[PDB]
């Protein structure tokens, strides 16, 4: 495994947990309260979820040259039920993603990229690749 | 895959349309085994062509009904793949054989048409073509499974298996079997 080698769900699942063990990520004190998207029906069932998003994002950046919060809000953004009106896109929160981006920096997984947008760092690039291997290794099944 | 072209994982060979005449708008694969109940499929242009279409897929298509469910083939393919698995658990066999059997057993042989009849319009007993027999059967079973599934906890894959199995050996438990007997009973009077 390149991270590209591992399936997205298991990769994210494994990394997100690894982050949880590490114990040092950092977390707008909120996260209990927050929905994550105006579109959103209820907050996240796994109140633990902050880690999962972080993993998801780290993987998301590693794939691509550089990305920023607006893109993430939309990615997270689902369809919002206008009620009487037909449903439409609504890019998902900007505080969570930003905080995610800021926090990741602390670990050095990602760093400000040139010309705007955060890019993965070689430190992160190394870190993701390492867990990617661990996941591949676990088993067949 | 290279040895024999099985179904999701089921063999086309050795399934025999146990019913002369029907033979052949039920399309298994007197060579045609594939892999998946999904295809680009252009059946519509010609009147006949539909017969070519694998019966499995034909059944899958009928599955995606009701305005909301239109165009959800992926959903149907998923349901069909599950149903075959449930059917198999229930009787071994080829669930595809089970499917074929239900289809053979359900097509109304005889039917009725609303002949003008002057006034008190009476209805004329007429025999029914094999294309119709196939077409009608697949509806009946699908409408049967869909109707049952709707207010119950049970899933379409399950209700489909139940409709298919009961029909394969015509239990008459099935909605479809009861419907077919009703249509036929009507055909006989009138005459």
């Amino acid at each position: 495994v390149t991270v590209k080698d591992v399936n997205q769900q298991e990769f994210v699942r494994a990394l997100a947990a690894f982050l949880k063990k590490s114990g040092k990520l950092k977390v707008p004190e909120w996260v209990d309260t927050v929905k994550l998207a105006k579109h959103k029906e209820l907050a996240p069932y796994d109140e633990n979820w902050f880690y999962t998003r972080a993993a998801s994002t780290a993987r998301h950046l590693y794939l691509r040259g550089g990305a920023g919060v607006g893109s993430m809000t939309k990615i997270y953004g689902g369809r919002q039920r206008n009620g009487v009106m037909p449903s439409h896109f609504s890019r998902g929160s900007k505080s969570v993603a930003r905080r995610v981006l800021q926090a990741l920096e602390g670990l050095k997984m990602v760093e400000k990229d040139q010309d705007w947008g955060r890019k993965l760092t070689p430190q992160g690039q190394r870190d993701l690749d390492r867990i990617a291997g661990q996941v591949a290794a676990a088993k067949k099944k | 895959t290279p040895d024999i072209k099985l179904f999701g994982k089921w063999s086309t060979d050795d399934v025999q349309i146990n019913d002369i005449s029907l033979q052949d708008y039920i399309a298994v694969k007197e060579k045609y085994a594939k892999y998946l109940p999904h295809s680009a499929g252009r059946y519509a242009a010609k009147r006949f062509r539909k017969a070519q279409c694998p019966i499995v897929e034909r059944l899958t298509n009928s599955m995606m009904m009701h305005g909301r469910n239109n165009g959800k083939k992926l959903m149907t393919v998923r349901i069909v793949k599950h149903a075959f698995e449930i059917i198999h658990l229930l009787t071994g066999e080829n669930p595809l054989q089970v499917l074929v059997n239900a289809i053979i057993n359900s097509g109304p042989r005889e039917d009725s048409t609303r002949i003008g009849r002057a006034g008190t319009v009476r209805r004329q007993a007429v025999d029914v073509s094999p294309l119709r027999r196939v077409n009608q059967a697949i509806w009946l079973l699908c409408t049967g499974a869909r109707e049952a599934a709707f207010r119950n906890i049970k899933t379409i894959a399950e209700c489909l298996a139940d409709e298919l199995i009961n029909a394969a050996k015509g239990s008459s438990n099935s909605y479809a079997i009861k419907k077919k007997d009703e249509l036929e009973r009507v055909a006989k009077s009138n005459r």
Binding site: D32, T33, K35, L42 | -
Partner: protein
């Protein structure tokens, strides 16, 4: 596993116990779903269960949070009554007390004789909507 309660009361409403807590709570006037969902998360409960389950302990704990939400990392924007006016509150009205304040507010602008008030009094509409074709029955 275990059992008990069916049928528990919190502050002046009867709450079906069979039901899931988050949903179970939402009988209480002023507890909508987004509410009750966040209150419970605050209140430490295994989210995974039925209102009929849980302890008398956890219950007071839900109520305590429910009527002092601000004091528990619940933001004000989550709240029913921001900016009171009469006291310049923030607040989150609850239970029988929502019907109450609803009455107040309607009275307020009926005293003042404002057109909205008048509308409520005749039992028409107060947002700008056309009244020619609908709300007829």
């Amino acid at each position: 596993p275990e059992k008990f309660q069916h049928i528990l009361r919190v502050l002046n409403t009867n709450i079906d116990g069979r039901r899931k807590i988050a949903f179970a709570i939402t009988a209480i006037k002023g507890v909508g779903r987004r509410y009750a969902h966040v209150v419970l998360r605050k209140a430490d409960i295994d989210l995974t269960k039925r209102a009929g389950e849980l302890t008398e302990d956890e219950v007071e704990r839900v109520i305590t949070i429910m009527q002092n939400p601000r004091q528990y990392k619940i933001p004000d924007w989550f709240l029913n009554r921001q900016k009171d006016v009469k006291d310049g509150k923030y607040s989150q009205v609850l239970a029988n007390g929502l019907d109450n304040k609803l009455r107040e507010d309607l009275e307020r602008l009926k005293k003042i004789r404002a057109h909205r008030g008048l509308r409520h009094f005749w039992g028409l509409r107060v947002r700008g909507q056309h009244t020619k074709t609908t709300g007829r029955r």
